[PDB]
Amino acid sequence: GSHMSDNNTIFVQGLGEGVSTDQVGEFFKQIGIIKTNKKTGKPMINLYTDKDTGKPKGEATVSFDDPPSAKAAIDWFDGKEFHGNIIKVSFATRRPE
Template sequence: DKRTGRPKIWLYRDKETNEPKGDATVTYEDPHAAVAAVEWFNNNWLCLKKSNCSNVNFAFRGACNRCGIARPTGASGILGVGGRGKGRAAQESGGISRPAGGGIFGPNDWPCPMCGNINWAKRTKCNICNTNKPGIMRVV
């Protein structure tokens, strides 16, 4: 931060091991940007187990989809707001919990049955694994 000379992102670390705990404090100059960030990241989590990963994972993932490391126990949303997000019951989304309306997902966005990625409604194939959207037949 230019005004205070302090970092805008503060990672909390274990005092004994100096490993990241999975929690951080983020400072924003613009309050609207702070609200938008909370909305975007609510209940998602940042992989900090490998120094070269730093992947943001959707809340429903139990392991990082980039490096495969298991989600840290007790890891909440990456902005410390975990547990406040809205969610649909797992049975409503094919066994995958995801945020309900008002977030970054629309009512017709769909979870991939193969990899669990949430795809925009307009997609006919998963943008991660190329699996067809459920109900879409592939013409040969």
């Protein structure tokens, strides 16, 4: 585990085909508090879906309040499926540009 940067982001996979709306943030609220990220000052919603192919990419990132809670969510809160499609949680990429 340990300390990995001052960047709070988690990367989530498999949130695409048959997915529900911005409600995914409430899914993560079932284990935690919704954090306002200091990088832009917005609440945690990032929905990545390419409409250029017409079907969703399946990618989303959300910002948690504690960094150790992100690692713990990879252990118990991941390892299953969301809506029948395989989900994966990561620490994402650091340095918001």
